[PDB]
Amino acid sequence: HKSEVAHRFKDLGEENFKALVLIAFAQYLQQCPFEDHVKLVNEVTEFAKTCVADESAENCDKSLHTLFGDKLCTVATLRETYGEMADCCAKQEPERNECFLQHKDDNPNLPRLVRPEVDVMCTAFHDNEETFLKKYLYEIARRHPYFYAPELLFFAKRYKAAFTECCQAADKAACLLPKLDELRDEGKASSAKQRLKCASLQKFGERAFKAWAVARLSQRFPKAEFAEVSKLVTDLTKVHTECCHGDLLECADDRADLAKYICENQDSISSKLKECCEKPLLEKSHCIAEVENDEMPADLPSLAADFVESKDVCKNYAEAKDVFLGMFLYEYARRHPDYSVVLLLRLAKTYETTLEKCCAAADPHECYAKVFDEFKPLVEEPQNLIKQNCELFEQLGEYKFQNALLVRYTKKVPQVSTPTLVEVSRNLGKVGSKCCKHPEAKRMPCAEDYLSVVLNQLCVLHEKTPVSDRVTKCCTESLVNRRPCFSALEVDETYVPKEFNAETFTFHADICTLSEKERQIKKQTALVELVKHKPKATKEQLKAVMDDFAAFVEKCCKADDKETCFAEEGKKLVAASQAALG
Ligand SMILES: CCCCCCCCCCCCCC(=O)O
Ligand SMILES: CCCCCCCCCCCCCC(=O)O
Ligand SMILES: CCCCCCCCCCCCCC(=O)O
Ligand SMILES: CCCCCCCCCCCCCC(=O)O
Ligand SMILES: CCCCCCCCCCCCCC(=O)O
Ligand SMILES: CCCCCCCCCCCCCC(=O)O
Ligand SMILES: CCCCCCCCCCCCCC(=O)O
Numbered sequence: 001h002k003s004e005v006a007h008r009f010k011d012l013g014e015e016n017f018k019a020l021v022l023i024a025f026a027q028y029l030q031q032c033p034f035e036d037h038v039k040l041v042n043e044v045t046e047f048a049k050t051c052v053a054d055e056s057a058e059n060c061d062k063s064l065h066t067l068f069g070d071k072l073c074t075v076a077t078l079r080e081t082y083g084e085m086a087d088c089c090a091k092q093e094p095e096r097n098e099c100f101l102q103h104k105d106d107n108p109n110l111p112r113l114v115r116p117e118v119d120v121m122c123t124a125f126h127d128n129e130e131t132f133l134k135k136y137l138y139e140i141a142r143r144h145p146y147f148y149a150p151e152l153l154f155f156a157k158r159y160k161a162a163f164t165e166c167c168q169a170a171d172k173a174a175c176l177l178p179k180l181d182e183l184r185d186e187g188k189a190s191s192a193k194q195r196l197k198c199a200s201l202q203k204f205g206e207r208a209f210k211a212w213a214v215a216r217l218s219q220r221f222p223k224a225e226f227a228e229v230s231k232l233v234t235d236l237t238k239v240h241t242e243c244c245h246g247d248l249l250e251c252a253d254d255r256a257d258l259a260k261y262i263c264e265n266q267d268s269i270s271s272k273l274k275e276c277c278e279k280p281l282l283e284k285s286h287c288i289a290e291v292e293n294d295e296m297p298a299d300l301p302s303l304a305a306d307f308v309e310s311k312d313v314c315k316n317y318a319e320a321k322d323v324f325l326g327m328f329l330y331e332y333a334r335r336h337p338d339y340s341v342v343l344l345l346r347l348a349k350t351y352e353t354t355l356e357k358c359c360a361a362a363d364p365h366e367c368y369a370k371v372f373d374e375f376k377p378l379v380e381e382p383q384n385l386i387k388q389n390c391e392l393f394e395q396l397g398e399y400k401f402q403n404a405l406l407v408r409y410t411k412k413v414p415q416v417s418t419p420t421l422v423e424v425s426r427n428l429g430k431v432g433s434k435c436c437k438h439p440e441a442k443r444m445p446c447a448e449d450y451l452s453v454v455l456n457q458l459c460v461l462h463e464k465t466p467v468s469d470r471v472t473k474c475c476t477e478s479l480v481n482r483r484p485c486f487s488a489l490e491v492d493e494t495y496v497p498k499e500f501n502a503e504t505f506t507f508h509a510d511i512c513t514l515s516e517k518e519r520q521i522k523k524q525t526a527l528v529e530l531v532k533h534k535p536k537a538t539k540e541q542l543k544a545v546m547d548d549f550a551a552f553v554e555k556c557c558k559a560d561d562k563e564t565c566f567a568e569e570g571k572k573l574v575a576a577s578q579a580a581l582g
């Protein structure tokens with residue numbers, strides 16, 4: 001186009017345009033105050049409108065990169081506030097845009113964003129809706145400078161809807177606060193999956209990524225022919241490679257190009273895309289990324305004919321090994337939207353190892369005729385774990401399910417900090433509540449997605465304060481083996497019990513007036529410390545103490561002098577437990 005800035009304004013609309021411009025400037029200029037950014041936005045928006053009136057007007061034919069970088073270099077405090085970043089302005093394009101990209105700070109050392117009180121939030125929302133939401137858009141964007149800007153805007157719009165509904169409710173906090181909690185976790189999770197995709201691309205390479213994509217696209221689009229899936233894998237690997245590099249415009253163009261291709265070829269891909277493909281450009285690729293799986297074709301034959309029984313298996317494999325393995329994966333995956341992606345990848349690795357071994361024998365057909373037998377236990381291991389865990393969950397409920405997990409994992413890796421053990425155990429209990437309520441055919445993909453978030457959060461905490469070689473092994477393995485590795489951890493036989501600390505087991509009356517969440521965390525913290533100190537305690541012995549503890553808190557919180565109960569009765573509880581455990 002003649003004026004790229006005009007074309008974006010016409011397509012996005014003024015409101016969306018202004019929000020994305022704010023996000024982009026805040027992700028580059030993460031230390032500038034909100035008011036400086038509003039000013040930049042308004043100046044960009046009035047310039048764009050001149051181009052919309054006349055694509056021939058001055059500087060309207062410049063590229064978006066040129067115009068955006070020129071504008072960053074007009075910021076008066078650029079050297080004073082960002083130092084080295086200001087040297088990027090001495091560069092010509094495209095060197096200049098690359099230089100700005102390298103100086104984004106993914107950990108900018110800003111204070112934590114505090115969630116104010118419900119009445120305070122709703123009153124600001126009422127008083128000035130636009131400034132309220134845009135100031136938070138700025139606060140979030142500047143702390144997460146690689147988060148894809150359109151998706152940030154998608155969250156903002158759901159926040160607007162939560163405040164609009166809940167600030168009119170009779171019980172405002174009961175309406176609003178679980179919505180805020182859901183949006184925060186979903187947002188944190190989306191950021192985790194973006195960073196994990198990019199890190200895994202770098203370490204394990206393009207082929208491993210393409211394998212994942214084949215499985216993932218074949219479950220989503222089971223009616224597509226392999227050649228169409230395989231072209232989609234190629235395009236999607238380009239999109240993720242460019243987006244991981246971090247330039248917003250290039251990432252957005254690649255995503256938009258792929259969505260347009262999909263929507264122009266729906267008959268070859270899926271019957272579920274009509275609604276997404278009617279949406280504006282801004283929303284299209286995100287919508288497609290979240291489409292439900294297509295219904296699979298009926299009466300698909302077994303894989304045995306093409307992959308086990310054919311006389312030609314080794315010949316077809318040897319002439320194009322990755323293509324044949326891709327076809328096996330495509331056929332296996334389109335048939336099993338109830339499997340995790342990593343499960344499908346385990347099966348393809350197993351099939352590959354067998355063909356490597358068996359196509360070297362004089363009778364390969366005899367050698368690999370049983371290969372589908374090897375898949376059965378790989379498939380069953382995660383199915384059985386889900387059954388067991390969801391059963392335990394319905395029998396205990398989330399809290400006591402969390403506690404069962406807390407004791408198990410403390411004993412396996414008692415060197416982990418107590419905060420992390422509590423947090424990871426709680427989040428794992430949340431996975432059970434979320435995914436156990438799905439029918440069986442959707443439980444494994446649910447578990448894979450949310451476990452990938454929780455286990456990454458663990459590996460991230462641990463990578464920075466490492467304490468256990470066995471965790472570091474599970475966190476550095478292939479992502480295909482990550483969960484089985486964690487599932488294979490055993491009780492630490494060589495741990496030296498932690499030395500008793502009286503204060504760790506001293507409880508005060510503030511526990512009666514704490515939040516339910518903080519009371520839970522308080523008790524789960526002490527349960528972890530209890531297992532760290534007496535790791536060889538039986539479940540019977542632990543339950544006895546947990547029951548003594550429960551009577552101890554309920555009694556003292558109803559007693560006239562509470563402070564004295566907790567200290568005197570408390571001393572009794574400790575002395576008795578110390579005798580009943582070891
Ligand atoms: C990227 C979304 C921006 C839209 C505005 C966010 C909503 C305002 C409240 C945010 C307060 C912190 C949230 C939380 O801690 O749960
Ligand atoms: C957290 C990843 C990007 C944000 C996605 C929007 C929804 C979450 C809003 C609340 C997150 C707080 C951000 C922070 O405190 O750093
Ligand atoms: C169609 C192009 C992709 C070909 C993929 C071949 C898949 C078979 C081997 C899978 C190996 C597992 C991936 C990984 O190591 O993480
Ligand atoms: C940065 C200057 C403002 C205009 C361009 C903002 C970036 C384009 C985002 C909208 C396109 C989304 C495409 C997609 O994700 O499928
Ligand atoms: C880069 C994400 C947006 C690209 C456009 C959607 C193409 C089909 C995606 C199918 C699901 C893949 C999930 C993913 O990797 O985001
Ligand atoms: C602090 C981290 C300690 C180790 C965490 C282990 C994570 C296990 C992931 C799979 C859990 C499936 C349910 C189960 O069998 O417990
Ligand atoms: C905390 C337990 C959550 C529900 C039960 C999860 C059991 C393990 C799931 C295994 C499937 C995830 C992906 C994989 O390893 O194949």
Ligand SMILES: CCCCCCCCCCCCCC(=O)O
Binds near residue numbers: 533547573574
């Ligand atoms: C040797 C130290 C003994 C300390 C005795 C008190 C132990 C407190 C464990 C608390 C477990 C709370 C579980 C619950 O009922 O929610």
